[PDB]
Design a protein around this nucleic acid. Sequence first.
DNA 1: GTCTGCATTCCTC
DNA 2: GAGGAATGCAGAC
Length: 676
Amino acid sequence: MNVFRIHGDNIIECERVIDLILSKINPQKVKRGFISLSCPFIEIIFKEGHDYFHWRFDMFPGFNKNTNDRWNSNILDLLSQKGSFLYETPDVIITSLNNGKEEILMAIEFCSALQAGNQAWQRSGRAYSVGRTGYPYIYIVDFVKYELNNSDRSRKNLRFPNPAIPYSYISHSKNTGNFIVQAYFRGEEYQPKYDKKLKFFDETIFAEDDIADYIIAKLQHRDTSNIEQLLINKNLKMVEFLSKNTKNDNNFTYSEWESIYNGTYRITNLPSLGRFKFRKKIAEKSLSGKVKEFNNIVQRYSVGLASSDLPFGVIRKESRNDFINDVCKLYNINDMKIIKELKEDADLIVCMLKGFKPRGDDNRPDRGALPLVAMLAGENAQIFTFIYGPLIKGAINLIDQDINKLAKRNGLWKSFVSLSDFIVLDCPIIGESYNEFRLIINKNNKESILRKTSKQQNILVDPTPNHYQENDVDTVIYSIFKYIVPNCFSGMCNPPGGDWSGLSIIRNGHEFRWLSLPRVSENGKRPDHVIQILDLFEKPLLLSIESKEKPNDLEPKIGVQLIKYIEYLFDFTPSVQRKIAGGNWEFGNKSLVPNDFILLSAGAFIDYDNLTENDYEKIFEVTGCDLLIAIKNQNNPQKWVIKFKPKNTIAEKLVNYIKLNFKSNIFDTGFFHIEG
DNA sequence: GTCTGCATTCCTC
DNA sequence: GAGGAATGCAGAC
Ligand SMILES: [Ca+2]
Ligand SMILES: [Ca+2]
Ligand SMILES: [Ca+2]
């Protein structure tokens, strides 16, 4: 037998890896259960002709945030031991268990989000940091999803990433010798017959089968060079699709990307560099100090890097002296030593970022801007980072005492301090009338950070955490309603730190799905789980569940708000629909009505038998929930004790159905004890 | 209170 | 209208 571990943000992320494996592997025998209270498992027996294989995948939902807050040891430390100095966390880490320790096989990130401008590089930090470790990095992104107007939930123009984003993964792969790739899965809203923007998209770009093949080959310890080349070719084909759809006068053409790809030129020595300039777009509301003046100086000497409006460009060594002179004149820089450092004879990449929102809170997308530059032109390139967003007084005080202290606590400052050779600030200060100008020669500091690795030591995560939280409530709820209770369906599942999944409803042999679910609802709140049961009542049951660590965490009227959220989505035509036999997704045509279903709400939480009959009555009064699911762990022997408390006779019929049908041929129901 | 994970919306060319 | 810039949220530290 071979044992693998799937460390994920939550149970849903872990299960997505299993679903990829299961899509290509047709197992003979499948067993599910728990190895510990927090860790579910899937044990499969499959064959490749005459060759049988026995694998077990132990899932570890919830990564550590500090060092030993959830698990006894952090699996992410194995990445920091190999050079991953950014605390960017992937969605999943797959490990192999050999000689009493774990060994990373790959890191996976799932992104459904709209690739709208800077959202495309928001998570480039994890690709950069994990990519420089030698462990493979796979970025799976849904192509395509539409943006909605929210006023009436109608569709707006499709959003595509800049061609340089998919390309950065290919260039980081070449520079490091590692496998870092962007893979595209067919989204439900990919409807080329209806949208002219997709007329020239090659459907061979989709990588569902190749991602499954790659994972299985890695698990089997086989040569993945061929699969890697197929995946790199699809990433290159996406660069072709995107670059051939943009105006060539301000963006790189496919011929330019191809010449960099085949090794004819490097991105900074392209013979055509300069045909377009770097022209950073700054909103009027973001302007302050001498920022507009600095931007004019950059546009006087810059050459465009990939796109004229990307937040970075190049100042060639031939123009560096004049650019530095102009910056010195603008900001009154007169120190001879500083000027000599700035005038080094090499090409300089200038990156201009706001960095901070009006309240001083850091911009999440900006954390990936320097990693994007480093992935395209190599981390060794000289980077001049200009910041103009508002700083909290505490941040500017740390900049003047120890910039590394600020980088230690904040991820945006960590991105800036790790990859910038020069850090220039022209920032407003919260509580002050005018801007602060700073020029930090960060060259030696950057060099030291690029060679930093944490203590070398083996890691084997103990399957029992420090304590059981909301993620464990979600794992238990997911296991019960998705694997144990029959004729069930998981339309919605949003555990702590989860993706924007969407809601699926099955009715009359069709599956209807709402995508791009907004968090803001006038009368409702998005449920953490929506379970559909069709063989209990004449009308299908939709059970909306909100999970918390404690019963007191259930907000007032949460039960009513969950129902109102479902009613809110029913007021709009589903985004997509498909037949259960056909399987081909189409745009939604017919509307769904709430009275065609029985809507119930439930609150799930951990309680160590501290709730009396009157306490349950008070929770029902506060929340308005139709059902309360009190969960408690028993340590000796390990078991999850479940107590179902119904408010009304409809919920009581559901409870009796769960009790009678708490039996499975796949899931080990022996790990649970249902009190009632 | 702030982390950093998750996003959709705003604004300039 | 194209496409980056700019904005906020949440559970557990
Ligand atoms: Ca995540
Ligand atoms: Ca994700
Ligand atoms: Ca929740």
